Structures are given as C-alpha cells and as structure tokens.
Design an enzyme around this catalytic site. Structure first.
Site, PDB file in Angstrom:
ATOM      1  N   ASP A  21       0.827  -1.208   0.000  1.00  0.00           N
ATOM      2  CA  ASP A  21       0.000   0.000   0.000  1.00  0.00           C
ATOM      3  C   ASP A  21       0.865   1.263   0.000  1.00  0.00           C
ATOM      4  OD1 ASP A  21      -2.959   0.777   0.132  1.00  0.00           O
ATOM      5  OD2 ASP A  21      -2.136   1.982   1.771  1.00  0.00           O
ATOM      6  N   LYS A  24       2.796   0.529  -5.531  1.00  0.00           N
ATOM      7  CA  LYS A  24       3.428  -0.331  -6.529  1.00  0.00           C
ATOM      8  C   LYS A  24       2.605  -0.394  -7.814  1.00  0.00           C
ATOM      9  CE  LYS A  24       4.752  -4.252  -4.944  1.00  0.00           C
ATOM     10  NZ  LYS A  24       4.666  -5.586  -4.292  1.00  0.00           N
ATOM     11  N   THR A  25       1.309  -0.687  -7.684  1.00  0.00           N
ATOM     12  CA  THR A  25       0.440  -0.784  -8.853  1.00  0.00           C
ATOM     13  C   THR A  25       0.305   0.564  -9.548  1.00  0.00           C
ATOM     14  OG1 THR A  25      -1.530  -0.422  -7.499  1.00  0.00           O
ATOM     15  CG2 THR A  25      -0.800  -2.694  -7.818  1.00  0.00           C
ATOM     16  N   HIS A  62       2.526  -8.760   0.095  1.00  0.00           N
ATOM     17  CA  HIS A  62       2.029  -9.360   1.324  1.00  0.00           C
ATOM     18  C   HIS A  62       2.935 -10.514   1.734  1.00  0.00           C
ATOM     19  CE1 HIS A  62      -1.790 -10.699   3.746  1.00  0.00           C
ATOM     20  NE2 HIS A  62      -0.823 -10.227   4.511  1.00  0.00           N
TER      21      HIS A  62
HETATM   22  N1  GDP Z   1       0.219  11.326  -1.838  1.00  0.00           N
HETATM   23  C1  GDP Z   1       0.800  10.310  -2.520  1.00  0.00           C
HETATM   24  N2  GDP Z   1       0.185   9.100  -2.534  1.00  0.00           N
HETATM   25  C2  GDP Z   1       0.721   8.050  -3.199  1.00  0.00           C
HETATM   26  C3  GDP Z   1       1.993   8.246  -3.911  1.00  0.00           C
HETATM   27  N3  GDP Z   1       2.299   7.065  -4.478  1.00  0.00           N
HETATM   28  C4  GDP Z   1       1.311   6.189  -4.158  1.00  0.00           C
HETATM   29  N4  GDP Z   1       0.372   6.775  -3.394  1.00  0.00           N
HETATM   30  C5  GDP Z   1      -0.851   6.123  -2.863  1.00  0.00           C
HETATM   31  O1  GDP Z   1      -0.761   4.701  -2.996  1.00  0.00           O
HETATM   32  C6  GDP Z   1      -2.040   4.165  -3.345  1.00  0.00           C
HETATM   33  C7  GDP Z   1      -1.889   2.990  -4.306  1.00  0.00           C
HETATM   34  O2  GDP Z   1      -1.485   1.836  -3.572  1.00  0.00           O
HETATM   35  P1  GDP Z   1      -1.275   0.416  -4.302  1.00  0.00           P
HETATM   36  O3  GDP Z   1      -0.194   0.498  -5.353  1.00  0.00           O
HETATM   37  O4  GDP Z   1      -2.573  -0.056  -4.912  1.00  0.00           O
HETATM   38  O5  GDP Z   1      -0.829  -0.557  -3.098  1.00  0.00           O
HETATM   39  P2  GDP Z   1       0.321  -1.663  -3.312  1.00  0.00           P
HETATM   40  O6  GDP Z   1       0.088  -2.402  -4.608  1.00  0.00           O
HETATM   41  O7  GDP Z   1       0.313  -2.640  -2.161  1.00  0.00           O
HETATM   42  O8  GDP Z   1       1.660  -0.969  -3.363  1.00  0.00           O
HETATM   43  C8  GDP Z   1      -2.847   5.300  -3.958  1.00  0.00           C
HETATM   44  O9  GDP Z   1      -4.144   5.361  -3.357  1.00  0.00           O
HETATM   45  C9  GDP Z   1      -2.072   6.567  -3.656  1.00  0.00           C
HETATM   46  O10 GDP Z   1      -2.878   7.464  -2.886  1.00  0.00           O
HETATM   47  C10 GDP Z   1       2.603   9.595  -3.849  1.00  0.00           C
HETATM   48  O11 GDP Z   1       3.683   9.842  -4.427  1.00  0.00           O
HETATM   49  N5  GDP Z   1       1.965  10.544  -3.154  1.00  0.00           N
END
Ligand code: GDP
Ligand code: KIR
Length: 371
Positions: A21, A24-25, A62
């Site tokens: 979270d 990454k995606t 995870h």
């Molecule tokens: N404010 C901010 N939020 C970020 C940034 N990069 C990612 N996010 C947050 O990360 C979330 C996406 O998470 P996700 O990739 O789906 O989770 P993961 O796959 O477990 O890494 C989004 O809702 C963004 O709000 C950033 O540079 N600035």
RNA sequence: GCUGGCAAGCGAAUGUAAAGACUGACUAAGCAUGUAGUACCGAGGAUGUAGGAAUUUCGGACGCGGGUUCAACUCCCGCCAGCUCCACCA
C-alpha cells in the site's frame, strides 16, 4: 493472439516488490502510461523501451504471498523497491530485500514515493540515506545505484515535470540493467508457474523458459508431480502476441494439446523428450552457517521436515546424514541425503532453498541423484 | 653334591640345607643412569565418591518439525489430510 511480435530489443524482466500500500500498482501503471504516451496477484504488464523491451511484474508485497513471490523474483531480472519517503524502511521492506538477496536478484533500483507530500528538502535526503545505509549493510550495492524520488500517482495526472522524471527513471533502469545472459544452449526446458484454459484454444501453461528454444509444432514432455507424460505444442505466444520461436529467459505462455486443468498443476516442467527424469531422493551439500545466516540457534537433531523450494514450487522433505555427525546443529557445511514426496525433474548443480516457519534456514546444491 | 680329620657298616648312631650383603658390565647377552625389585596377577588388600540390580522419576505420543505456556496433548508458525470462498483467459 493477433499481433506478430518482433524479437527486437531483447526481453528483460523487471519486478516491483515494494512496500504494501505504498503505490506499486500505481507506479507501474504510471510507467506504462508515460512510456506508451511518449513512445507510442502478479500483474505482468509490458512496455517497449527504445533500448530494451521490458516485462514489468508487480508482485504481491504481502508476507503470506511469499511462496509465489519467490518464483516472481526468481523470474525477475531487476528489482524495484517501491517505498514511501515519509515512512522510510519498514519490516516488510526488510523482509522483501532479504528474500530478494536469498533468491539472487543482482540489480535493484530504489524509488521514493510521496515526494511532494513532504514540504522539505532534508527529510527526503534523510530517508534516502537511511535506505542506502540499509542496502549497504544488508549486502547490497551502494553509491553506484540510481535512486529515484518522485510521485507515483501524479505521474498519471496532467503534468510535465514528473513525466520527465519518470522518463528519466525508465532510462537509467534500462541503462543500469544491461543485456542479460541467456542459456539457449541445452535442449528446451520451461518450469510451469500458472495454467489458463482458453475456450476454443485449450490449456496454456505460463513460465520463464529455463533453457532451449521452442518451435511451433514441437513435441515436449511434461515431467513433475506424480506424472511423466508427453504432449504437443501448437501456437507459441507471449503476452497475447503471435510468436515463432521462444528463447530462454522471458515469461511466455505455451499452448499444450491434450491437457487437463486439474491433471496439470504448478511445479512441473516442459522439457525436451529424454532429457530429465523425476526423482524423490537425492544427495546435496548444505551451506548453513552458525547463527547469522537464517539458520536457527538451538542444536536441532534428525527428523527435520523443512520445505525445499525449487525453481517452481516447494515440498516438505526429510534429511538423513552419514555417520560422523551425531547432531545436525546449525553450521552444516556437510553433505546429506534429502528425500521428497513429490518427484520433480532435477539435474546436478541445482540450487534449492531450505525454509521453515516462514524463514530461510540455509541453501543446498544438488550433488547426485538417488531416484 | 664328589672330597675333606677319623671313630661306624660299606648297606651303620644317622646329618646343622644360612643364602643376605658386597666389587662392577647395567639399558639381563653392543648399547641411557642398578643391589633389591618401578614389573605380574586373580582371589592378596583396598575404591564403594558412580555406574550396573530394586528405588522417586527426566526421557516418550495424539501429524510431523521446531523459535513458544513447560502444565502441550491444538501456549506461537511453515506444511500436509478433508470442507468452503473466490482470484485465475498466452
Ligand atoms: N500522496 C501520494 N500518494 C501516493 C503516492 N504514491 C502512491 N500513493 C498512494 O498509494 C495508493 C496505491 O497503492 P497500491 O499500489 O494499490 O498498493 P500496493 O500495490 O500494495 O503498493 C494510492 O491510493 C495513492 O494514494 C505519492 O507519491 N503521493
Ligand atoms: C528464498 C527462497 C527461495 C529461493 C529460491 C532458490 O534460491 C537459491 O537456491 C539460493 C541459493 C544461492 C538459496 O538457497 N537461497 C535461500 C536460502 C539461503 C540463503 C542465502 C542465499 C544466504 O546465503 C547462505 C544469503 C543471504 C547470503 O548471505 C550473505 C550475507 C548475509 C546477509 C544478511 C542476512 C541474513 C541471512 C541474516 O540472517 C541477518 C543478519 O545477519 C543480520 C540482520 N538480519 C538478518 O536477517 C550474502 O548476502 C548471501 O546472499 C537460488 O538462488 C535459486 O536460484 C532459487 C531462486 C531457485
């Protein structure tokens, strides 16, 4: 299955195994969008850099998904540590870097999200220094690694500065990851990692070609758990694109004829006929150290039942040692005999991983085979 | 033990039987250091504090492995044997 793929800009695999979270995606989607704009579960997206064509694997960060993440990283040729610059290193990040080092990922690039969420010019440098120190202390490269700061979600928002920054990120990714070595010398071999059932097409098996090439219409042999059988390939493809031959080192999906979804499970290998034979017991030398190499502290004894992870999957196994070793206390540089339940086609020199309780105990190299 | 001074027969009265010290070659019979022995036991003496007999129990086995409350026989984890839920279209 409607695009004739050209084998130019040799395929290189890049995997994002960053923090949970932390974007990454979003980061991989932004990379794909900006590259396709300026140039015209494990998520396997692709993009064609002017230097090399890359397949980006967004792996689940995870802890419980470590089993498939092992293959995703072994599948991977270059790691991208995706972390927030407002929190710094995390226990999950440390576990991921330990797993990457244990699977043997040579090149790693660090990316710092939430650059604009911090209105300062010192905290970003502090967290970058902290992660660099962590890398240097955990047996990773140092000041010769491109470290990337910037926003991962604003790269998709209408801008120019972050678009240029992410383009520069892609550039040194392709610069810092040179032409990888491929092993197309021996006959064809491909470990299986996923199975799909195409209506009207049949069963297709996905994976990275370990060695050799696969021409359309070639006979191959399925060797693995409880079964050694034969089959025929028709329609070699890669990322829903038409192919003619499949080299080694790239993740492709081979179509098999006369394959049952429940009969074929993950863990098997598509090899050339008469090449490898499955075995259930084999001799191997272990490389466990005293205390600071994953191995436990107390001097455990025989009857140990760890999971022996391989190129594809793992299995619970038993270990027996020759006389001269009363205990199997950590510090085992000796050779022993490992017996497994599920037979897997193996060859001499194979490197496997010994794990237990969610942590790696030591490594092992196959020395001989006892069938 | 033959002799040794002679009574006694050559088949008669009928025998004291100590055996340690001292010189030296010592590596017993080339060759390292000697005057009583450091050896060798076997029925000669002793150990009895610890391992063998009973005697309290530690050891084990409820799937295994171990980092866990030790009271583990499910107090923490990875698997495998079944049930369910989906992800899962090169
Ligand atoms: N404010 C901010 N939020 C970020 C940034 N990069 C990612 N996010 C947050 O990360 C979330 C996406 O998470 P996700 O990739 O789906 O989770 P993961 O796959 O477990 O890494 C989004 O809702 C963004 O709000 C950033 O540079 N600035
Ligand atoms: C991880 C499981 C899956 C791996 C799959 C297979 O791994 C492999 O078989 C592999 C064989 C090399 C394997 O068995 N790996 C799986 C199993 C074995 C693990 C390998 C490698 C190690 O060496 C004993 C490896 C860490 C090794 O340590 C060196 C330095 C130490 C680093 C520190 C971290 C460690 C440990 C640590 O305890 C530690 C610490 O000390 C301080 C603080 N906190 C810590 O946590 C160096 O960095 C080397 O890389 C092959 O890479 C195959 O290609 C593979 C991908 C099929």
């Amino acid at each position: 299955s409607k695009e004739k793929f050209e084998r130019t800009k040799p395929h290189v695999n890049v995997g994002t195994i960053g923090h949970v979270d932390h974007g990454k995606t979003t980061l991989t989607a932004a990379i794909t969008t900006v590259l396709a704009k300026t140039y015209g579960n494990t998520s396997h997206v692709e993009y064609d850099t002017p230097t090399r064509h890359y397949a980006h694997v967004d792996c689940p960060g995870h802890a419980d998904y470590v089993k498939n993440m092992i293959t995703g990283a072994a599948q991977m040729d270059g790691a991208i540590l995706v972390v927030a610059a407002t929190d710094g290193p995390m226990p999950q990040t440390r576990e991921h870097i330990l797993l990457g080092r244990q699977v043997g990922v040579p090149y790693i690039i660090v990316f710092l999200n939430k650059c604009d969420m911090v209105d300062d010019e010192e905290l970003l440098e502090l967290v970058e220094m902290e992660v660099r120190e962590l890398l240097s202390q955990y047996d990773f490269p140092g000041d010769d690694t491109p470290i990337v700061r910037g926003s991962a979600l604003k790269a998709l928002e209408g801008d120019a500065e972050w678009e240029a920054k992410i383009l520069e990120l892609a550039g040194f990714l392709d610069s810092y990851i040179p032409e990888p070595e491929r092993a197309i010398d021996k006959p064809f071999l491909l470990p299986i990692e996923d199975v799909f059932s195409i209506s009207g097409r049949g069963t297709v098996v996905t994976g990275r070609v370990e060695r050799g090439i696969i021409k359309v219409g070639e006979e191959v042999e399925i060797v693995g758990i409880k079964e050694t059988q034969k089959s025929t390939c028709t329609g070699v493809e890669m990322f829903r694109k038409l192919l003619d031959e499949g080299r080694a080192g790239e993740n492709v999906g081979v179509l098999l004829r006369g394959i049952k979804r429940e009969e074929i499970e993950r863990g098997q290998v598509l090899a050339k006929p008469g090449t490898i034979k499955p075995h259930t017991k084999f001799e191997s030398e272990v490389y466990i150290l005293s205390k600071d190499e994953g191995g436990r502290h107390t001097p455990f004894f025989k009857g140990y039942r760890p999971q022996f992870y391989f190129r594809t999957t793992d299995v619970t196994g038993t270990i027996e040692l020759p006389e001269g070793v009363e205990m199997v206390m950590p510090g085992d540089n000796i050779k022993m005999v490992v017996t497994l339940i599920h037979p897997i086609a193996m060859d001499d020199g194979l490197r496997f991983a010994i794990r237990e309780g969610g942590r790696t105990v030591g490594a092992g190299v196959v020395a001989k085979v006892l069938s």
